[PDB]
Amino acid sequence: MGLSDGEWQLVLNVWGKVEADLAGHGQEVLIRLFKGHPETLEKFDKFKHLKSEDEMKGSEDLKKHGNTVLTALGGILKKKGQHEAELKPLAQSHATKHKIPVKYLEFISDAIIQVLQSKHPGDFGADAQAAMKKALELFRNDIAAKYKELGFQG
Numbered sequence: 679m680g681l682s683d684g685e686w687q688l689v690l691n692v693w694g695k696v697e698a699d700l701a702g703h704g705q706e707v708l709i710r711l712f713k714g715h716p717e718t719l720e721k722f723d724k725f726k727h728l729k730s731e732d733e734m735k736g737s738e739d740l741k742k743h744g745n746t747v748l749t750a751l752g753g754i755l756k757k758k759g760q761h762e763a764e765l766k767p768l769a770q771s772h773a774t775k776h777k778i779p780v781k782y783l784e785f786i787s788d789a790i791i792q793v794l795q796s797k798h799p800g801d802f803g804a805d806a807q808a809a810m811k812k813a814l815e816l817f818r819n820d821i822a823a824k825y826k827e828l829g830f831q832g
């Protein structure tokens with residue numbers, strides 16, 4: 679249940695393209711998630727209302743959360759699987775006061791794939807797509823183990 683060195687290299691090679699504009703990519707990832715799975719909006723404080731006023735795009739809340747989610751994820755991916763230090767607190771924040779089911783982590787993983795396919799088709803071929811899916815699977819499987827310890831079924 680790990681990635682090979684070459685799988686990690688594929689992941690970090692395409693992540694280079696995301697690092698050029700973390701905030702723009704992160705906002706896009708969340709929009710993708712909310713369009714494909716609008717039920718995920720219920721987990722935030724401000725996006726349902728912004729959406730109700732046709733104001734999600736360019737909002738301060740989308741900017742803040744877009745930066746947060748991909749800044750954090752990039753730090754985790756660069757650990758290449760040795761990420762317990764990051765995932766213990768991250769699981770706690772997504773399993774306690776805010777309860778984020780694993781299916782929603784699955785959905786944002788799919789959203790990341792779709793955004794990268796759309797924005798960087800020439801840098802996101804078959805092997806890179808498979809490796810990124812596998813990294814994101816590892817990412818939520820290790821979160822899910824911590825969910826179990828935390829008493830959250832996911």
Ligand code: HEM
Binds near residue numbers: 767782786
């Ligand atoms: C790639 C997956 C994700 C990453 C890396 C991530 C990252 C973060 C980070 C860094 C925080 C700040 C607290 C902390 O630093 O531990 C946070 C909080 C939070 N996350 Fe996530 N998150 C992810 C997925 C999700 C998803 C899919 C949802 C909801 C559908 C979600 C909902 C929230 C909420 C509601 C908070 C609390 C924010 C607040 O109090 O306004 N997260 N997340």
